[PDB]
Amino acid sequence: MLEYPIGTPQNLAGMEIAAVYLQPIDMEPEGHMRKASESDIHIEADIHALSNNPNGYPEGFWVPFLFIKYEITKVGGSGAPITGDMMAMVASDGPHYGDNVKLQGPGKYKVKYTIYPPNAKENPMSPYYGRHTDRETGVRPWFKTFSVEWDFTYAGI
Amino acid sequence: EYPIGTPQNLAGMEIAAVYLQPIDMEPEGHMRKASESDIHIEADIHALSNNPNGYPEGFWVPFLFIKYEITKVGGSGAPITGDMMAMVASDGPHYGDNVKLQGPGKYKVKYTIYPPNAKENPMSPYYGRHTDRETGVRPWFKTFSVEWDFTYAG
Numbered sequence: 620m621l622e623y624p625i626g627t628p629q630n631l632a633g634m635e636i637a638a639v640y641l642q643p644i645d646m647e648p649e650g651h652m653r654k655a656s657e658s659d660i661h662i663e664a665d666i667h668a669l670s671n672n673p674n675g676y677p678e679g680f681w682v683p684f685l686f687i688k689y690e691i692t693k694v695g696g697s698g699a700p701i702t703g704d705m706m707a708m709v710a711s712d713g714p715h716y717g718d719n720v721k722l723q724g725p726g727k728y729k730v731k732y733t734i735y736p737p738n739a740k741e742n743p744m745s746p747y748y749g750r751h752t753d754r755e756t757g758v759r760p761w762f763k764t765f766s767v768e769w770d771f772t773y774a775g776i
Numbered sequence: 777e778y779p780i781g782t783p784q785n786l787a788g789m790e791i792a793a794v795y796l797q798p799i800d801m802e803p804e805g806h807m808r809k810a811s812e813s814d815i816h817i818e819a820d821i822h823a824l825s826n827n828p829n830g831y832p833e834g835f836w837v838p839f840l841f842i843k844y845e846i847t848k849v850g851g852s853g854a855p856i857t858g859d860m861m862a863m864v865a866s867d868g869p870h871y872g873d874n875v876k877l878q879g880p881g882k883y884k885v886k887y888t889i890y891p892p893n894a895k896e897n898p899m900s901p902y903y904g905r906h907t908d909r910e911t912g913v914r915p916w917f918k919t920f921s922v923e924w925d926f927t928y929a930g
């Protein structure tokens with residue numbers, strides 16, 4: 620697959636957090652994504668387990684059932700961020716968190732993701748994902764909600 | 777960890793049925809208490825090579841919904857039924873449930889596997905699939921069932 624990286628990946632709580640973008644996409648179920656024709660990019664959060672992940676994920680595994688909120692701000696622009704929620708989905712290169720986004724033209728942008736664990740109150744998937752807690756097969760508690768930021772230059776794609 | 781027959785390959789996925797001792801899970805109150813159960817039943821679903829839904833080989837297939845039916849051979853004939861739940865343990869993510877059985881003997885285990893877009897799947901509103909030429913994948917598989925036989929000895 621072809622993609623454009625946003626800065627350098629960041630490591631927290633036994634996970635690698637990377638930001639990427641590509642052209643707007645089409646998704647099933649329809650009507651969840653902003654129409655490809657009314658967007659500039661498809662923004663994505665690539666979250667994979669590092670070695671010795673404390674929540675039982677083997678290295679390189681996709682970290683599922685997370686909830687991601689983003690804020691995108693143009694440097695030198697209005698000052699008001701472009702906000703939204705990402706959705707979990709699968710593409711030809713595998714599962715990820717993404718959203719179709721309309722930007723404010725070419726320039727430098729600041730990107731911030733707020734990453735919610737499976738048990739967060741804000742996470743709508745919390746009733747559907749468990750975690751073993753017994754000695755034999757149990758794992759460490761979930762990480763706390765955190766935020767991650769990068770800068771990037773958008774030219775149009 | 778005890779295997780239930782041999783894994784089966786369908787729709788670019790490997791499906792294995794296993795069991796182990798009953799477990800404890802967060803959030804509490806979803807699993808049947810370990811003290812009131814005999815086994816923790818599990819469905820191990822991983823992508824094969826050339827999986828049609830975009831999963832690289834060996835990846836856990838997420839957002840599925842699994843229903844099981846366990847019947848004792850020679851017993852009442854009425855199956856033990858339930859729903860599995862997606863969860864993570866020390867060996868990774870899987871679908872599982874704490875189950876009370878009907879003593880030692882031979883059992884028939886059937887799993888019904890629902891794709892992310894199935895009406896029966898409560899996670900359907902939360903998982904998408906790219907459909908465009910560049911990044912898209914093939915449609916989801918249709919709901920299917922897999923069966924095995926196994927001897928339980930505690």
Ligand SMILES: [Cu+2]
Nearest residue numbers: 708716717718
């Ligand atoms: Cu996407």
Ligand SMILES: [Cu+2]
Nearest residue numbers: 863865872873
């Ligand atoms: Cu389990």
Ligand SMILES: [Mg+2]
Nearest residue numbers: 622665712715
């Ligand atoms: Mg990717």
Ligand SMILES: [Mg+2]
Nearest residue numbers: 777818867870
């Ligand atoms: Mg296991």
